[PDB]
Design a protein around this ligand. Structure first.
Ligand SMILES: C[S@@+](CC[C@H](N)C(=O)[O-])C[C@H]1O[C@@H](n2cnc3c(N)ncnc32)[C@H](O)[C@@H]1O
Ligand SMILES: C[S@@+](CC[C@H](N)C(=O)[O-])C[C@H]1O[C@@H](n2cnc3c(N)ncnc32)[C@H](O)[C@@H]1O
Lengths: 215, 205
């Protein structure tokens, strides 16, 4: 049985470096936009693309007990947790974090992370986190902040314990298109991409229809 | 419910329906129309960037912070007599909209300064009647305008509404939505691309 931590490091390496899945998904999303445009249902939209990935990806791991991903090569990880188990993990309630443009590092007040940089992370990781959230409204809030935190074409890694088609509609409704789904032992591993255009992903969701993340 | 009505509209204005981009088109149509009549020329037109997935909402008169539950809404809740702990204490009339700052600056537990052009939405839900003077009612509405980003919306729930449109248009706010709910009147006013455009519309209206 393979680890979710290895599965995620493997995809992030394929998506940005070894296989360039960020470029394959870009070419597709551009094709869907041309198609929608030619059916008259979308038209002009804003498109933002990612530059060549850096040699060190900025990864945000929210709900990290330990820092599983810190040692991975080419991953500069910022680890946040409500009840950290290791000292390298920052204390934070993600639900109470502001996504601030114009900054780069977490800003802490009274030991807790209160502010994170917007459009800064090539990857945000929610490994077995959303299930703790009290309501479905707060699960979608976590995903919405992640979207604000991701760079264009960045990826949100979502690992849930043992509706996905709703999680796919609900996330495309906010600008996140799924790019991978695999069933590992006792867990479902997903990746959602920050599409080149939110309007495009939102349109895909409209055609493919609950607007929250339930359990 | 007025809280469900507002959350629904804000989502349609910024995300689901793009009313902010439709009302932009409507206002650039009206400006080029004035310009054709020589009643307005080149003018300062300010547009909004693509709204974040988490919007900055200011709830003035927030008694218990009902909007902090909306997923799209990061709410900074103010109230002269907070009924909940998540709500900051403040007398909006004694608060200054300050350009440069980025967060609310408090003094002795009361909010005294707020960031200008920082919020996509400001909410006056049944507040402007608990204000004494009609010049303080406008002061609230004038600080909302300064707190709002280009093309942001001011939600206004009320317990003449034509003279209300004109008075708010004179300060740069043109209405975009109106619906009657049980016992209240729900309104939304947008910060037009140009204040001079909005003021022009009010003079003609
Ligand atoms: C699945 S477990 C531990 C992480 C797991 N080893 C993984 O693969 O990421 C749940 C984690 O989510 C954290 N958590 C729950 N709510 C949180 C919140 N509001 N902000 C940050 N972390 C939170 C818990 O503290 C806990 O560390
Ligand atoms: C009828 S309540 C509206 C509360 C909430 N918006 C709602 O939907 O029920 C009037 C609110 O405006 C507040 N208020 C009155 N004057 C204020 C002022 N000068 N600054 C801030 N809040 C004020 C009151 O404390 C009260 O919470």
């Amino acid at each position: 049985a393979r680890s979710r931590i290895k599965w995620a490091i493997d995809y992030i390496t394929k998506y940005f470096f070894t296989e360039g899945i960020y470029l394959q998904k870009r070419q597709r999303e551009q094709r869907l936009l041309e198609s929608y445009r030619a059916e008259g249902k979308l038209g002009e939209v804003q498109c933002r693309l990612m530059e060549e990935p850096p040699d060190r990806l900025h990864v945000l791991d929210v709900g990290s007990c330990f820092n599983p991903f810190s040692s991975a090569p080419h991953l500069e990880v910022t680890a946040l947790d409500l009840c950290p188990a290791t000292e390298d993990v920052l204390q934070a309630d993600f639900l109470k974090v502001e996504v601030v443009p114009g900054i780069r590092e977490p800003e802490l007040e009274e030991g807790s992370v209160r502010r994170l940089p917007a459009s800064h992370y090539e990857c945000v990781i929610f490994s077995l986190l959303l299930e703790y959230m009290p309501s479905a409204e707060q699960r979608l809030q976590c995903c919405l902040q992640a979207y604000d935190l991701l760079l264009p074409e960045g990826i949100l890694v979502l690992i849930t314990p043992d509706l996905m088609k709703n999680w796919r509609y609900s996330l495309a409704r906010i600008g996140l298109l799924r790019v991978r789904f695999e069933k590992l032992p006792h867990i479902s591993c997903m990746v959602f991409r920050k599409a080149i255009s939110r309007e495009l992903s939102q349109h895909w969701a409209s055609i493919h229809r609950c607007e929250e993340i339930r359990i």
